[PDB]
């Protein structure tokens, strides 16, 4: 055939600070978007790059706003909002992504970055977020689960409004994937994030 | 018929703080518009998330202006316009909303968030709030 053209999606083993696994359905099916965010110091400013559409812009804004009113609930700094520079990066800078179904994934990334506790990349995330933390359901979750199972992910996080969606999931896929059901991100942010931080946050 | 295709919105009995039940006309029939806002510290800014329509950008501003001109009427913070940052949001996070009808909901949502007084969803909100507070009549009232 020739040279390796593409590279398969791989479930990264080591949990890394400021990273979050994600699943974004595409014309070729859901993809394991590796959401990358930053918590570099400075003044208050939000950066949304990687061809991030508005449907993701207000999604990230809503997730950050929820984290702003839940500082001690997840161990965030008490004075971060004025003194944080958030740069939500999504692979690939060329890919013009669309849709707010990755609200939990981006929220998990910023949460891990602020709390300095790496999220579980070995787990896949899907579902948008509100200011109350309630995780709304999505459309087309079977493709996301399929991609997560194929890429080596064995654990999934799903909103507690999507139980009706699991019957259409493929059989051999569903047993091999443990399905965590969450009503709000207040259950995701302790099941995913490590119970301890590794590297110190920005002061 | 397979798995359910939609999830009806119910009226959460317990009073939610910073959120207010609302009604909005729509060609897909009738639905419960949900208005949720946050009262976070900051330097004073207003953001309109949820892919809101240009029409809601002045109705919400007028409601917040009425609350600003009536801060002592309901125990609102005396200087929240330099400390509290307004983050108005309305689900679906990606649904095309339009019309200032039932704008009072936003006023009530902001009041609940500011005064920490939860608003009951057993009561629904309808009507456009003026700068003076007068509630002008709207259309499509029967479906909402």
**Interface contacts A/B by beta carbons within 8 Å:** 69
CB A156 within 8 A of CB A179: yes
Distance separating alpha carbons of residues B72 and B74, to the nearest angstrom: 5
Instruction: For A65-94, give one letter per residue: b (16+ CB within 10 A) or e.
Output: bbbbbbbeebbbbeebbeebebbbbbeeee
Instruction: Using CA coordinates, name the residue in chain B closest to A128.
Output: B93
Listed by number, the residues of chain A in 39-58 with a beta carbon closer than 8 Å to a beta carbon of chain B are: 44, 54-55, 58
Collapsing DSSP to helix, strand or coil, B128 comes out as: strand
Q: Please judge whether A58 and B89 are an interchain contact, meaning their C-beta atoms are less than 8 angstroms apart.
A: yes
The helix-helix angle for A54-68 and A103-115 (nearest 10°) equals 40
**Tokens linked to A62:** 């809503």
Instruction: Select from A22, A29, A20 the least CA-distant residue to A146.
Output: A29
Alpha helices per DSSP H over A53-182: 54-68, 71-74, 103-115, 142-150, 171-176
CB A105 within 8 A of CB A21: yes
Interface test mutation site (partner B, options A64, A132, A141, max chain B beta carbons within 10 A): A132
Peptide bond into A54 cis (omega under 30): no
Instruction: Select from B93, B124, B89, B69 the least CA-distant residue to B18.
Output: B89
Residue B29 to chain A, least CA–CA distance (Å): 21
Distance separating alpha carbons of residues B72 and B18, to the nearest angstrom: 19
Collapsing DSSP to helix, strand or coil, A151 comes out as: coil
Lookup result for tokens 């087309």? A140
Instruction: For B38-70, give one letter per residue: b (16+ CB within 10 A) or e.
Output: bbbebeeebbbbbbbbeebeebbbbbbebbeee
Task: Give Cα separations from A179 to A119, A162, A176, B59 (angstroms).
Answer: 17, 11, 9, 42
Interface test mutation site (partner B, options A45, A62, A73, max chain B beta carbons within 10 A): A62
How many CB atoms lie under 10 A from the CB of residue A41? 11
Distance separating alpha carbons of residues B11 and A187, to the nearest angstrom: 23
Distance separating alpha carbons of residues B103 and B128, to the nearest angstrom: 5
Of B3, B40, B92, the CB nearest to A65: B40
Chain A contacts of B18, Cβ < 8 Å? 131-132
How many CB atoms lie under 10 A from the CB of residue B75? 12
Task: Give Cα separations from B143 to B26, B27, B91, B97, B133 (angstroms).
Answer: 9, 10, 19, 16, 24
Residue B89's DSSP bridge partners are B36
| Technique that determined the structure | cryo-EM
How many CB atoms lie under 10 A from the CB of residue B126? 19
CB A145 within 8 A of CB A121: no
Listed by number, the residues of chain B in 3-42 with a beta carbon closer than 8 Å to a beta carbon of chain A are: 3-4, 7, 16, 18-19, 36-42
**Residue A18 region by backbone torsions, left for phi larger than 0, else alpha for psi between -120 and 50, else beta:** left
Distance separating alpha carbons of residues A148 and A9, to the nearest angstrom: 9
Residue B137 to chain A, least CA–CA distance (Å): 30
Interface test mutation site (partner B, options A77, A130, A169, A183, max chain B beta carbons within 10 A): A130
Residue A193 to chain B, least CA–CA distance (Å): 24
CB A85 within 8 A of CB A47: yes
Of B7, B43, B93, the CB nearest to A62: B93
**Tokens linked to A23:** 């699943």
């Amino acid at each position: 055939l020739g040279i390796p053209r593409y590279r398969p999606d791989k479930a990264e083993t080591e949990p890394q600070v400021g990273t979050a696994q994600g699943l974004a359905w595409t014309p070729v099916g859901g993809t394991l978007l590796t959401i990358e965010v930053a918590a570099v110091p400075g003044s208050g400013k939000l950066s949304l790059t990687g061809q991030l559409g508005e449907v993701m812009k207000e999604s990230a804004q809503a997730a950050l706003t929820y984290l702003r009113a839940h500082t001690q609930d997840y161990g965030l700094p008490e004075d971060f909002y004025n003194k944080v520079d958030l740069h939500v990066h999504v692979p690939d800078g060329a890919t013009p992504k669309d849709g707010p179904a990755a609200g939990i994934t981006m929220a998990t990334a910023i949460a891990s970055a602020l709390s300095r506790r790496p999220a579980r990349m070995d787990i896949a995330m899907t579902g948008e977020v509100s200011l109350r933390g309630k995780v709304m359901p999505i459309g087309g979750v079977k493709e996301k689960l399929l991609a997560a199972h194929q890429a080596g992910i064995h654990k999934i996080v799903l909103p507690k409004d999507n139980e009706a969606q699991l019957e259409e999931l493929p059989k051999e896929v569903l047993e091999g994937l443990e399905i965590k059901l969450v009503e709000d991100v207040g259950e995701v942010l302790e099941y995913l994030l490590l119970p301890e931080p590794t590297m110190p946050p920005v002061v």
